[PDB]
Amino acid sequence: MKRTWQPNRRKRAKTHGFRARMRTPGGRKVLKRRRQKGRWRLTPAVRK
Amino acid sequence: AVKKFKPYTPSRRFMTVADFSEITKTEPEKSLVKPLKKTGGRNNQGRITVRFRGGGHKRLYRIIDFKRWDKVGIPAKVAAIEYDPNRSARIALLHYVDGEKRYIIAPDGLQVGQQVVAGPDAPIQVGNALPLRFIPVGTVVHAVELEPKKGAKLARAAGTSAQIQGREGDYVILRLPSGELRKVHGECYATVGAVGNADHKNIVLGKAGRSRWLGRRPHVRGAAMNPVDHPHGGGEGRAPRGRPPASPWGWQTKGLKTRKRRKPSSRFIIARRKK
RNA sequence: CGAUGUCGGCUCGUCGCAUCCUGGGGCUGAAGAAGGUCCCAAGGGUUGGGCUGUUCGCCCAUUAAAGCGGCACGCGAGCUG
RNA sequence: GAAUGCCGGCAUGAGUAACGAUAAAGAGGGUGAGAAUCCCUCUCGCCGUAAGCCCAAGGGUUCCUACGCAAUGGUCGUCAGCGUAGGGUUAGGCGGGACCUAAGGUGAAGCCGAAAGGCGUAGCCGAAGGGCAGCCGGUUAAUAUUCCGGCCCUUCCCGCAGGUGCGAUGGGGGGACGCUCUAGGCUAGGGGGACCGGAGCCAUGGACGAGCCCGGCCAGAAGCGCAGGGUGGGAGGUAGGCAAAUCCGCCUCCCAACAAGCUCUGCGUGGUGGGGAAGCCCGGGUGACAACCCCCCGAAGCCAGGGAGCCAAGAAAAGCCUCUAAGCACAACCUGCGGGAACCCGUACCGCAAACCGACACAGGUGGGCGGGUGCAAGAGCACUCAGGCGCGCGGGAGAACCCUCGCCAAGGAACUCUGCAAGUUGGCCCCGUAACUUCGGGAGAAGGGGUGCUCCCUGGGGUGAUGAGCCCCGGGGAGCCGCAGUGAACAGGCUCUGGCGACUGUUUACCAAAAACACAGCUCUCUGCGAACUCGUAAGAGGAGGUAUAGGGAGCGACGCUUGCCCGGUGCCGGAAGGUCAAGGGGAGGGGUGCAAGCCCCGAACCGAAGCCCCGGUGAACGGCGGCCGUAACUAUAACGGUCCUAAGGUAGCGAAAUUCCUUGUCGGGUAAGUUCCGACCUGCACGAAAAGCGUAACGACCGGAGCGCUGUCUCGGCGAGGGACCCGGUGAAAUUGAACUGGCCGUGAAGAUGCGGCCUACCCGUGGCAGGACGAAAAGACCCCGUGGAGCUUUACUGCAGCC
RNA sequence: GAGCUAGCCCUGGCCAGGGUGAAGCUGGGGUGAGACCCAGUGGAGGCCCGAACCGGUGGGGGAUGCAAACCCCUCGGAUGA
RNA sequence: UGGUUCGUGGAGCCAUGGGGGAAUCUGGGCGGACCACCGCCUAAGGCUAAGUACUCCGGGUGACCGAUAGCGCACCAGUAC
RNA sequence: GCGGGGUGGAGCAGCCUGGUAGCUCGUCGGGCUCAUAACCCGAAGGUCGUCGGUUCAAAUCCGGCCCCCGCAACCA
RNA sequence: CCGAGGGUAGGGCCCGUGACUGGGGCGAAGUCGUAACAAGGUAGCUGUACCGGAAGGUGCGGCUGGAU
RNA sequence: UGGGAGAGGGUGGUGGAAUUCCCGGAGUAGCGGUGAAAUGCGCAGAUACCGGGAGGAACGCCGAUGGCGAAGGCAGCCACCUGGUCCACCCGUGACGCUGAGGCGCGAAAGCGUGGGGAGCAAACCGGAUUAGAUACCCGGGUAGUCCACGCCCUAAACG
Ligand SMILES: [K+]
Ligand SMILES: [Mg+2]
Ligand SMILES: [Mg+2]
Ligand SMILES: [Mg+2]
Ligand SMILES: [Mg+2]
Ligand SMILES: [Mg+2]
Ligand SMILES: [Mg+2]
Ligand SMILES: [Mg+2]
Ligand SMILES: [Mg+2]
Ligand SMILES: [Mg+2]
Ligand SMILES: [Mg+2]
Ligand SMILES: [Mg+2]
Ligand SMILES: [Mg+2]
Ligand SMILES: [Mg+2]
Ligand SMILES: [Mg+2]
Ligand SMILES: [Mg+2]
Ligand SMILES: [Mg+2]
Ligand SMILES: [Mg+2]
Ligand SMILES: [Mg+2]
Ligand SMILES: [Mg+2]
Ligand SMILES: [Mg+2]
Ligand SMILES: [Mg+2]
Ligand SMILES: [Mg+2]
Ligand SMILES: [Mg+2]
Ligand SMILES: [Mg+2]
Ligand SMILES: [Mg+2]
Ligand SMILES: [Mg+2]
Ligand SMILES: [Mg+2]
Ligand SMILES: [Mg+2]
Ligand SMILES: [Mg+2]
Ligand SMILES: [Mg+2]
Ligand SMILES: [Mg+2]
Ligand SMILES: [Mg+2]
Ligand SMILES: [Mg+2]
Ligand SMILES: [Mg+2]
Ligand SMILES: [Mg+2]
Ligand SMILES: [Mg+2]
Ligand SMILES: [Mg+2]
Ligand SMILES: [Mg+2]
Ligand SMILES: [Mg+2]
Ligand SMILES: [Mg+2]
Ligand SMILES: [Mg+2]
Ligand SMILES: [Mg+2]
Ligand SMILES: [Mg+2]
Ligand SMILES: [Mg+2]
Ligand SMILES: [Mg+2]
Ligand SMILES: [Mg+2]
Ligand SMILES: [Mg+2]
Ligand SMILES: [Mg+2]
Ligand SMILES: [Mg+2]
Ligand SMILES: [Mg+2]
Ligand SMILES: [Mg+2]
Ligand SMILES: [Mg+2]
Ligand SMILES: [Mg+2]
Ligand SMILES: [Mg+2]
Ligand SMILES: [Mg+2]
Ligand SMILES: [Mg+2]
Ligand SMILES: [Mg+2]
Ligand SMILES: [Mg+2]
Ligand SMILES: [Mg+2]
Ligand SMILES: [Mg+2]
Ligand SMILES: [Mg+2]
Ligand SMILES: [Mg+2]
Ligand SMILES: [Mg+2]
Ligand SMILES: [Mg+2]
Ligand SMILES: [Mg+2]
Ligand SMILES: [Mg+2]
Ligand SMILES: [Mg+2]
Ligand SMILES: [Mg+2]
Ligand SMILES: [Mg+2]
Ligand SMILES: [Mg+2]
Ligand SMILES: [Mg+2]
Ligand SMILES: [Mg+2]
Ligand SMILES: [Mg+2]
Ligand SMILES: [Mg+2]
Ligand SMILES: [Mg+2]
Ligand SMILES: [Mg+2]
Ligand SMILES: [Mg+2]
Ligand SMILES: [Mg+2]
Ligand SMILES: [Mg+2]
Ligand SMILES: [Mg+2]
Ligand SMILES: [Mg+2]
Ligand SMILES: [Mg+2]
Ligand SMILES: [Mg+2]
Ligand SMILES: [Mg+2]
Ligand SMILES: [Mg+2]
Ligand SMILES: [Mg+2]
Ligand SMILES: [Mg+2]
Ligand SMILES: [Mg+2]
Ligand SMILES: [Mg+2]
Ligand SMILES: [Mg+2]
Ligand SMILES: [Mg+2]
Ligand SMILES: [Mg+2]
Ligand SMILES: [Mg+2]
Ligand SMILES: [Mg+2]
Ligand SMILES: [Mg+2]
Ligand SMILES: [Mg+2]
Ligand SMILES: [Mg+2]
Ligand SMILES: [Mg+2]
Ligand SMILES: [Mg+2]
Ligand SMILES: [Mg+2]
Ligand SMILES: [Mg+2]
Ligand SMILES: [Mg+2]
Ligand SMILES: [Mg+2]
Ligand SMILES: [Mg+2]
Ligand SMILES: [Mg+2]
Ligand SMILES: [Mg+2]
Ligand SMILES: [Mg+2]
Ligand SMILES: [Mg+2]
Ligand SMILES: [Mg+2]
Ligand SMILES: [Mg+2]
Ligand SMILES: [Mg+2]
Ligand SMILES: [Mg+2]
Ligand SMILES: [Mg+2]
Ligand SMILES: [Mg+2]
Ligand SMILES: [Mg+2]
Ligand SMILES: [Mg+2]
Ligand SMILES: [Mg+2]
Ligand SMILES: [Mg+2]
Ligand SMILES: [Mg+2]
Ligand SMILES: [Mg+2]
Ligand SMILES: [Mg+2]
Ligand SMILES: [Mg+2]
Ligand SMILES: [Mg+2]
Ligand SMILES: [Mg+2]
Ligand SMILES: [Mg+2]
Ligand SMILES: [Mg+2]
Ligand SMILES: [Mg+2]
Ligand SMILES: [Mg+2]
Ligand SMILES: [Mg+2]
Ligand SMILES: [Mg+2]
Ligand SMILES: [Mg+2]
Ligand SMILES: [Mg+2]
Ligand SMILES: [Mg+2]
Ligand SMILES: [Mg+2]
Ligand SMILES: [Mg+2]
Ligand SMILES: [Mg+2]
Ligand SMILES: [Mg+2]
Ligand SMILES: [Mg+2]
Ligand SMILES: [Mg+2]
Ligand SMILES: [Mg+2]
Ligand SMILES: [Mg+2]
Ligand SMILES: [Mg+2]
Ligand SMILES: [Mg+2]
Ligand SMILES: [Mg+2]
Ligand SMILES: [Mg+2]
Ligand SMILES: [Mg+2]
Ligand SMILES: [Mg+2]
Ligand SMILES: [Mg+2]
Ligand SMILES: [Mg+2]
Ligand SMILES: [Mg+2]
Ligand SMILES: [Mg+2]
Ligand SMILES: [Mg+2]
Ligand SMILES: [Mg+2]
Ligand SMILES: [Mg+2]
Ligand SMILES: [Mg+2]
Ligand SMILES: [Mg+2]
Ligand SMILES: [Mg+2]
Ligand SMILES: [Mg+2]
Ligand SMILES: [Mg+2]
Ligand SMILES: [Mg+2]
Ligand SMILES: [Mg+2]
Ligand SMILES: [Mg+2]
Ligand SMILES: [Mg+2]
Ligand SMILES: [Mg+2]
Ligand SMILES: [Mg+2]
Ligand SMILES: [Mg+2]
Ligand SMILES: [Mg+2]
Ligand SMILES: [Mg+2]
Ligand SMILES: [Mg+2]
Ligand SMILES: [Mg+2]
Ligand SMILES: [Mg+2]
Ligand SMILES: [Mg+2]
Ligand SMILES: [Mg+2]
Ligand SMILES: [Mg+2]
Ligand SMILES: [Mg+2]
Ligand SMILES: [Mg+2]
Ligand SMILES: [Mg+2]
Ligand SMILES: [Mg+2]
Ligand SMILES: [Mg+2]
Ligand SMILES: [Mg+2]
Ligand SMILES: [Mg+2]
Ligand SMILES: [Mg+2]
Ligand SMILES: [Mg+2]
Ligand SMILES: [Mg+2]
Ligand SMILES: [Mg+2]
Ligand SMILES: [Mg+2]
Ligand SMILES: [Mg+2]
Ligand SMILES: [Mg+2]
Ligand SMILES: [Mg+2]
Ligand SMILES: [Mg+2]
Ligand SMILES: [Mg+2]
Ligand SMILES: [Mg+2]
Ligand SMILES: [Mg+2]
Ligand SMILES: [Mg+2]
Ligand SMILES: [Mg+2]
Ligand SMILES: [Mg+2]
Ligand SMILES: [Mg+2]
Ligand SMILES: [Mg+2]
């Protein structure tokens, strides 16, 4: 059938993007958190 | 009148449409149409705050002149009678002698080509706008301002009118479309006569789709729901109400008066409504 | 109860005998024929239909007869549902 | 040593199941250590409204070559979307940006919120919408509307000339619009040609033929031609389009008006530039100086902002045109030349898929365009077939049971079974012909029957041509021929009768229910006078609604027809300036504490003191409810009538063994040989009943009952045949399960159903194909049941709160 | 977290081909005038048949599957909610 | 209403959302309802080191671990997946 | 299995709270009427379902038996 | 070719008949009431609607075949 | 040709009396109704009286035994549009006439559909009395309806 994942580069960048994150206090915390754990990517990779 | 259809399909059996007899111009005035923002019934929170709305025909909003005391003593001609999707009533297009073109809600008996005017000086003749105090007691009237210069709020629906019962001080006594008896201020403007298309109410939509065309999505009965959704929800098989008939939000919906008793306008309402 | 799938049907049988029929008998209110009733006997046989999910049962047409029961109300790692 | 423990390792099941669509293969010749599987050729088969081709998502080097074969590839592998290396993506014109707006997002001003934050006009962001300048060919192993060739165009800057009151984020026009139907003329595309060009060809009985086979175009500025789109012209006044205005708007006047003119598109031609087949010579060379013409079919595409009818009434903003304002008129703009200048990003490759989403090279999912020809009435259906692509990455054998998919069956013809489930029958088109009932539409494709090919002859009307020939679309009449059969193949309704329920088309439990459920037009009740009611939010702010009682919210009922009775005592709701209670507060008779006191402090009765409740009323398409026991008729039976008890009032009409009837397969009738079902009746209705609507209703229904005709492998009752598996051989090789096992039958015994204990009987060791009776077989820490002072969802006149309202 | 799914908003797009033949319009009859009947024209509809597309009725297969919802045969809608 | 041990308690004290609303030392707060005596103190402006907390970092030392232990990571780990 | 009931001839009070059986109708007697119903005046009839117990005393309170109408019978 | 007729398929009219059901007509002395005929004890009759055990009642309009 | 009488018909306006209801005064112990009463309304201030508002229906006196119409039927007043009729003058035409199966139109009241209106009245209905009963007659309420528009129905003791 149609499955749950329908890759769309615009959707990705706008939902989980760095600019998306930084706006919302919760988003900034995701960044803070991911930075503290030392993730190599703070945010999903997407080709813009 | 009201045009009927031969029952060549099941819904066509009862469906009735407007005659559009009075309509003289079939596209609107470009300078007077703005786009209509369709809500879906959703507010700025994105939330549905009015149930069962959406999916209707696209519309443009004809800007209507509800003030009229803009152009006092400046006459206007009835250029055409047009279709407006945004109201029960029809709209009349006026070319003023000013050159300025505006829309008004078209009264009954209004004929294309006649000349209308607004002001204290105005003749008491259909389509003219005067402040209420200068209109003879006992004459039918529509498009009535509620407060001075604040806009026409009363009797804008097809076939409606308010009648002038009498006077008292700076206020006059009106009988509104509902049959309520109201004190409306003397300087409040009003157009003489009643709104046209009085055969509106006699229309039979005919089928579900007709309603859907009007942006009216299906209305589902509480009784058909579950206790999570409605007071009338639940029960094995069909069920009576089982409580005082109620809204989804729990207030009583048979006879429970809701208007705020301490409202300032209470001083001005002589008699509650009719039937 | 860290699971023994539960009516009825279908298929496949097998066992018991308190015998429905066929075989052998005694008594009869057994003339003959046809029955009644009891004894012996489980080798074989024991129909096709209408109605109901039905088991059962009633009815139709026959039949030598249209037996009653056990097998986890025999049988769903055989099917049906 | 045990925790269905945790981690890891290795076993068992087992050389077992499987190796992913049943579109299909065979051979020859290369390569090489090795070949069913890589390369080449011939033969055969499969897709062709695709399984072919372009495009957008998404993927991210998978692309092209060279060299490899450890792993990946469901086998092999020399091959590869694999490993290593090298190479490959070229734009002012194609897409996006340096343009414009849409929902939405953000947001100077402004608003609100404990903080974080929420909202918000202008503005700004935001596109697959508007605007905008490139078409054809050649070329690389791999890029091309990008490089190259030919023809063509856009913007910016500067300069020259002519021209003008020039000048804008301001004004105004335009941009600018629906659904259905559709005209004219073209083009895309197609078919045919006795015409033009073409290597060849004569076979096996015939044909040197008006024979075969093949091809017969593409792009193209200016000008011209055809077809369409758009647009009135001139004065006078003008108070309106937030300043101005010669622009637009309004009024008056002259003139003219499906013309013309003006301008804008499309098609045609067009200097020119290209392209060019079959066949056989090793992608190329040749054909070839290729020919490049005529006729017909003809778009859903073009002219396009065309036309008409309808109601549900069908974006914005910029580019562009025009008006003026500061300003400025050595400027500025308009026009035509000319030189110069023109940036960033994408461009490979997959793209219905082995490269995207599905853990897989996964029978699944994925938007747009093109999609040839013949025939079948049409068509994107169906069969074949072109271009093109493929034979689905294990094979070779055998011809058991059994399973799947399929074909046929004597006599019967539903006897099968819960049920004609399933499978037959029917099947397209044309012609005749069609009932109850009906809301006059329908029911109707009712039913039922006839025709259907091919040959010859005669003839009738239309399109294109020309009014003809030719081509092409509709027909009609007569005479014949063949076969078992002519919609000879593929595609393509079984019908009728009668009930229940829902009017109807719709909708629903993604992934066990598609229904009788939800919805629905329609009916009634009720709220709401607009800063509406109601909804969301602490608020601001929204929705409602740029609406205004012919409107908006809530509730029930659910087309339509005839109807919808009686109860207001309890509950709700509505009304009631009285009375009864009533909280803070007010009032302070009167007491109390301490003090030498002036004083400070505390309790405190009357009396005045809202809503709410009490109380008086109204209210059923408000919550709801709508009797009992006795008797009584000139036969029996029954009770129109009577008695009495209770009630707020005792079920009306219409229906009734019902989607409701327990007793129950009620009784009678119908249908049947036979009818617990069905239909029709009766009525002591366990326990119908009137908008949680009652009784009917044409039409409709993949809903659920009953019956009949048709026809059948459903059955009596089974038989044979087909292929794909099962089976044998080579290749690869899982799984759950598993305390260990050296794992028989009976009669017993045992925790009450023993391979494992007792007695007996039976039995050489070991496999393979099969069947499922047992291992209380597997699976899932029973979903039933109880237990737990375990949990959650839901309810209420349970308790206590809370928002909200008073 | 609304890249699945449900509703709404904005902007685009798709629906072969047949069949039925409403209103209207014209003509003819009609009548004082009408209503109205007839024929032609016309092309309406949650109209009919049926591909694409959207579904998912009945059965069978599949059930350590090709697939954690698939396949085959059939069947529903297909200008419209 | 909050804070304190203080849950309305005999409920002061400190703080304050609402209503009322003074005085300047003969003023004012407090010493657990309140009164009087006896005292303590000087509100409604602000600042102020050290002693105290913690360990990303550097070092020192362990009757701490010794590759399933010890940090999740002794190794290209917040990685692959 | 749980509940209400049994009383002049009929239908109902009285029981709860022991001592006192009542209301409407019917039956009978006398009136009015030509006569009958209606109507008017008076009258009779229960010994409280039976059996036992409590009591000074039982329709009444308690316990059996018989009857008579109700309500229930669910998870499988 | 036609063709008696046979067959299949659907229509039309008449007849008989049917669980049951609707009223009708008659039937020496049945049960209930008393609507009408005297102002019939509410004048009657009426078309129509609604209601009630039944005659009947009531509403709306009409007639006198009614008022004495 | 000229003249007359008339509730003949249709459309639109407009007038006052009366009933009800609502508001404001003033005022108090009952009002209403019957054969007599009860239900009912009224100290929550009714009836009776004065003032003001709204709304619907019907038109008092004139009014008659009268007038008009084919019948049904038609009654305040005003205007418009319109039918039939009688009289007189003897002018026009020249039997053009009478009747009328079908058809067609009209057709009280009730009733019906869709929408308005709803003061009074009032089937159904509820209550109070009468009564053996009283699904009636009388009383207090009361819904359709009565009223307007349009379309149906087409009956009558539509009678002289
Ligand atoms: K259960
Ligand atoms: Mg699906
Ligand atoms: Mg899909
Ligand atoms: Mg994207
Ligand atoms: Mg997106
Ligand atoms: Mg973002
Ligand atoms: Mg890094
Ligand atoms: Mg992130
Ligand atoms: Mg209609
Ligand atoms: Mg109109
Ligand atoms: Mg605009
Ligand atoms: Mg927002
Ligand atoms: Mg949000
Ligand atoms: Mg709402
Ligand atoms: Mg909504
Ligand atoms: Mg309108
Ligand atoms: Mg709409
Ligand atoms: Mg609904
Ligand atoms: Mg539900
Ligand atoms: Mg919820
Ligand atoms: Mg609830
Ligand atoms: Mg409920
Ligand atoms: Mg449920
Ligand atoms: Mg329910
Ligand atoms: Mg129920
Ligand atoms: Mg109900
Ligand atoms: Mg509320
Ligand atoms: Mg009101
Ligand atoms: Mg168990
Ligand atoms: Mg088990
Ligand atoms: Mg025997
Ligand atoms: Mg004998
Ligand atoms: Mg004998
Ligand atoms: Mg035997
Ligand atoms: Mg049976
Ligand atoms: Mg039985
Ligand atoms: Mg015998
Ligand atoms: Mg048993
Ligand atoms: Mg069993
Ligand atoms: Mg079984
Ligand atoms: Mg087993
Ligand atoms: Mg142990
Ligand atoms: Mg395990
Ligand atoms: Mg272990
Ligand atoms: Mg081993
Ligand atoms: Mg083997
Ligand atoms: Mg095995
Ligand atoms: Mg195998
Ligand atoms: Mg495969
Ligand atoms: Mg397979
Ligand atoms: Mg084949
Ligand atoms: Mg090699
Ligand atoms: Mg292969
Ligand atoms: Mg093709
Ligand atoms: Mg990938
Ligand atoms: Mg390899
Ligand atoms: Mg591999
Ligand atoms: Mg390999
Ligand atoms: Mg270029
Ligand atoms: Mg620049
Ligand atoms: Mg912008
Ligand atoms: Mg914001
Ligand atoms: Mg943009
Ligand atoms: Mg764009
Ligand atoms: Mg557009
Ligand atoms: Mg471009
Ligand atoms: Mg070009
Ligand atoms: Mg110059
Ligand atoms: Mg110029
Ligand atoms: Mg200028
Ligand atoms: Mg527009
Ligand atoms: Mg349309
Ligand atoms: Mg054309
Ligand atoms: Mg072309
Ligand atoms: Mg062709
Ligand atoms: Mg050709
Ligand atoms: Mg030869
Ligand atoms: Mg001006
Ligand atoms: Mg101006
Ligand atoms: Mg001028
Ligand atoms: Mg060539
Ligand atoms: Mg050459
Ligand atoms: Mg157009
Ligand atoms: Mg805008
Ligand atoms: Mg200046
Ligand atoms: Mg100068
Ligand atoms: Mg730049
Ligand atoms: Mg490229
Ligand atoms: Mg595609
Ligand atoms: Mg591929
Ligand atoms: Mg996934
Ligand atoms: Mg593969
Ligand atoms: Mg695939
Ligand atoms: Mg994949
Ligand atoms: Mg095509
Ligand atoms: Mg065809
Ligand atoms: Mg074999
Ligand atoms: Mg056969
Ligand atoms: Mg048969
Ligand atoms: Mg047969
Ligand atoms: Mg059977
Ligand atoms: Mg059946
Ligand atoms: Mg079937
Ligand atoms: Mg066929
Ligand atoms: Mg008909
Ligand atoms: Mg046929
Ligand atoms: Mg032939
Ligand atoms: Mg079909
Ligand atoms: Mg039934
Ligand atoms: Mg339905
Ligand atoms: Mg219906
Ligand atoms: Mg419905
Ligand atoms: Mg489901
Ligand atoms: Mg699921
Ligand atoms: Mg589910
Ligand atoms: Mg299913
Ligand atoms: Mg369905
Ligand atoms: Mg289903
Ligand atoms: Mg429903
Ligand atoms: Mg209705
Ligand atoms: Mg809220
Ligand atoms: Mg709120
Ligand atoms: Mg708005
Ligand atoms: Mg319902
Ligand atoms: Mg009917
Ligand atoms: Mg009540
Ligand atoms: Mg009540
Ligand atoms: Mg009450
Ligand atoms: Mg109070
Ligand atoms: Mg009711
Ligand atoms: Mg008797
Ligand atoms: Mg009942
Ligand atoms: Mg009743
Ligand atoms: Mg019955
Ligand atoms: Mg029966
Ligand atoms: Mg029942
Ligand atoms: Mg039964
Ligand atoms: Mg029976
Ligand atoms: Mg029978
Ligand atoms: Mg059966
Ligand atoms: Mg029946
Ligand atoms: Mg019975
Ligand atoms: Mg009801
Ligand atoms: Mg029906
Ligand atoms: Mg269905
Ligand atoms: Mg078979
Ligand atoms: Mg085979
Ligand atoms: Mg392998
Ligand atoms: Mg043995
Ligand atoms: Mg044993
Ligand atoms: Mg032992
Ligand atoms: Mg032993
Ligand atoms: Mg076994
Ligand atoms: Mg557990
Ligand atoms: Mg357990
Ligand atoms: Mg469950
Ligand atoms: Mg479980
Ligand atoms: Mg249990
Ligand atoms: Mg407990
Ligand atoms: Mg416990
Ligand atoms: Mg979404
Ligand atoms: Mg059509
Ligand atoms: Mg349709
Ligand atoms: Mg398409
Ligand atoms: Mg089937
Ligand atoms: Mg499954
Ligand atoms: Mg499938
Ligand atoms: Mg269809
Ligand atoms: Mg306490
Ligand atoms: Mg305490
Ligand atoms: Mg304290
Ligand atoms: Mg002091
Ligand atoms: Mg203090
Ligand atoms: Mg102190
Ligand atoms: Mg102290
Ligand atoms: Mg101190
Ligand atoms: Mg101080
Ligand atoms: Mg410190
Ligand atoms: Mg150690
Ligand atoms: Mg180690
Ligand atoms: Mg570390
Ligand atoms: Mg008592
Ligand atoms: Mg006593
Ligand atoms: Mg006594
Ligand atoms: Mg005598
Ligand atoms: Mg014969
Ligand atoms: Mg009478
Ligand atoms: Mg009488
Ligand atoms: Mg009388
Ligand atoms: Mg009488
Ligand atoms: Mg009765
Ligand atoms: Mg009555
Ligand atoms: Mg008389
Ligand atoms: Mg008083
Ligand atoms: Mg003469
Ligand atoms: Mg009439
Ligand atoms: Mg009637
Ligand atoms: Mg009716
Ligand atoms: Mg009255």
Tokens describing residue B72? 């006092």
**Span CA (A9) to C1' (D466), Å:** 66
Map chain B to HEC letters: CEEECCCCCCCCCCCEEECCCCCCECCCCHHHEEECCCCCCECCCCCECCCCECCCCCCEEECECCCCCCCCCCCEEEEEEECCCCCCCCEEEEEECCCCEEEEECECCCCCCCEECECCCCCCCCCCEEEHHHCCCCCEEECEECCCCCCEEECCCCCCCEEEEEEECCEEEEECCCCCEEEEECCCEEEECCECCCCHHHCCCCCHHHHHHCCECCCCCHHHCCCCCCCCCCCCCCCCCCCCCECCCCCECCCCCCCCCCCHHHHHEEECCCC
Question: Quick count: other Cβ atoms within 10 Å of Cβ B104?
Answer: 24
CA of B46 to the centre of ligand 149 (A): 84
CA of B196 to the centre of ligand 21 (A): 45
Dihedral (Cα; B116, B1, B63, B26), 10-degree rounding: -100
Expressed in angstroms and rounded, the spacing between residue B144 Cα and the centre of ligand 11 is 29
Closest CA to B152 of B107, B115, B108, B116: B107
What amino acid occupies position B54?
G
| PDB experimental method | X-ray
Q: Distance in angstroms, CA of B235 to C1' of I127?
A: 40
**Nucleotide lying nearest to A34, CA to C1' measure:** F78
